[PDB]
Amino acid sequence: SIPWNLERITPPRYRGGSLVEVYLLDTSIQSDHREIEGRVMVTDFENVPEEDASKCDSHGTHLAGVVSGRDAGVAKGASMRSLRVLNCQGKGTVSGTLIGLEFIRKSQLVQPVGPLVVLLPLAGGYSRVLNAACQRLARAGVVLVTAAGNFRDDACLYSPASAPEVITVGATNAQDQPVTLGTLGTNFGRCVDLFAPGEDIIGASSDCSTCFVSQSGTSQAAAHVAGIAAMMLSAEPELTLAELRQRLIHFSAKDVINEAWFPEDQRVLTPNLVAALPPSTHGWQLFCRTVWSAHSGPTRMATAIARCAPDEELLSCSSFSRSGKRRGERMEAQGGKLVCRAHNAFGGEGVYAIARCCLLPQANCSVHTAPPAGTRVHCHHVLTGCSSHWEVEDLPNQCVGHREASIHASCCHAPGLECKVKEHGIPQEQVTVACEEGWTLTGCSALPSHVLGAYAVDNTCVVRSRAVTAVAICCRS
Amino acid sequence: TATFHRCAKDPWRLPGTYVVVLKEETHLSQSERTARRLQAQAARRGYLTKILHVFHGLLPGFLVKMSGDLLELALKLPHVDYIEEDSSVFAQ
Amino acid sequence: XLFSFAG
Ligand SMILES: [Ca+2]
Secondary structure, X not given: OOOXXXXXXXXXXXXXXXXXXXXXXXXXXXXXXXXXXXXXEEEEEEOOOOOOOOOOOHHHHHHHHXXXXXXXXXXXXXXXXXXXXXXXXXEEEHHHHHHHHHHHHHHHHHOOOXXXXXXXXXXXXXXXXXXXXXXXXXXXXOEEXXXXXXXXXXXXXEEOOOOOOOEEEEEEOOOOOEOEEOOEEOXXXXXXXXXXXXXXXXXXXXXXXXXXXXXXXXXXXXXXXXXXXXXXXXHOOOOOHHHHHHHHHHOOEEOOOOHHHOOHHHOOOOOOEEOOOOOOOOOOOOEEEEEEOOOOOOOOOOEEEEOOOOOOEEEXXXXXXXXXXXXXXXXXXXOOEEEEEEEEOOOOOOOEEEEEEEEOOOOEEEEEEEOOXXXXXXXXXXXXXXXXEOOOOOOOOEEEEOOOOEEEEEEEEOOOOEEEEEEEEEOOOEEEEEOOOOOEEEEEEEOOOOEEEEEEEOOXXXXXXXXXXXXXXXXXX | OOEEEOOOOHHHEEEEEEEEEEOOOOOHHHHHHHHHHHHHHHHXXXXXXXXXXXXXXXXXXXXXXXXXXXXHHHHXXXXXXXXXXXXXXXXX | OOXXXXX
């Protein structure tokens, strides 16, 4: 009887959302449906384009039901407030959405409450202004959850999906595979933060006050995460956006998606995570996440930059190009904060910078660099990361690089933190080495035969080549 | 330095309405003055305009219904950061 | 691609 999706997000050990308010920007809703009655407030903010009643509130009623519905909702408690920015045909405007986001912020300023989650179950093309408005609202301290989009395409080409600081959610089905329906399906790529159930999701039907219907979409998926986030914020009202994101990632089911469903170049960029509620089991823990930059593009002096959130520390920095035409990467300071920068080679199509960004309070971190010598540098403190860059066209708390390369060590003073290094090598397109259960991968690199790059996937260090050796630095309290 | 942007998916564009985004610290009073100035400069050129909304609280700026002919003029207004043509969003 | 993938 438990809907498959609600079972899917239930942790392996288990026992909400009322201190939290969830805003919904959508079609009109049937607020008298028994799933949501008395739990959703209709603001009557409305900004929708002209067309070109049961059907009118179908989309919105279902999602309000996914988030907070008493029988089939994720966060059965939760309070919701609804804004109408989609018309009866489900169409809205960027300007209308902006006006809506502004309305939420004015409400907050006029009558402050607790943590806010804003669900944006909608998409248009890439919009500079819409992305900026989302970012600005995130920086004001509001959590935004958005749909990845339903076009079986790169989510970075859509808004608010591509919008920095917003949690972007793709949809997976009952077999934990990405939803695909012909030429349509879940979006994917590096702008997607995680996936959640978004096929065959039962919820409130606006046909009648007690009816139910199954719907599919990245909106349904985003609604699961809004519910999950609302529960997480009730339990821990002080979470920063970076902390909430690290928890959503940490508690997801990992490596459950068959990545063959995604286009080849998007596999590496797309996180293999299906959202789930935190367990009853939760003492301090080291949380890290992998942040891929935008591709640098092909200019000769091109650089890709991957950054961490203000409250995170950059513990390592790696890079990757599909061609292998790469000048490596370096950790460089910037506004008093370290970023991961990767360098394209002359004739390269471009490269990615790949940061490992971690929540490490009490950390004092620095970088130690040595110019081309092989080349070596050490933390003379724990080593959390090695990087290397070169300027040539071709070839023990210690990092070792190629003789023609500069080498950079990320060194932190973090008492109460233990780190070890685990190595693995073979004759090979991909070599792999994982931290032990309960350890957090902080750094991933290849021993210095021609590598495309290296990256952490959860707690597994992956090295890609064309005698290769993967090296993982793993830490815990 | 002010730039123009419109949706790359041509069918999703909504020409004739523009979001005028002003520089970050621009004050509401200035946003309003800038909108009126646009309306005046347009009117002297024979163009009707309508200010649909003035933005403040996240981004400063305004929403304006006008011919795209006026975009060169509008990009030269004081405080302008960029202008974006309105476009469609959809239930997912 | 609105309403369960235009389904
Ligand atoms: Ca994102």
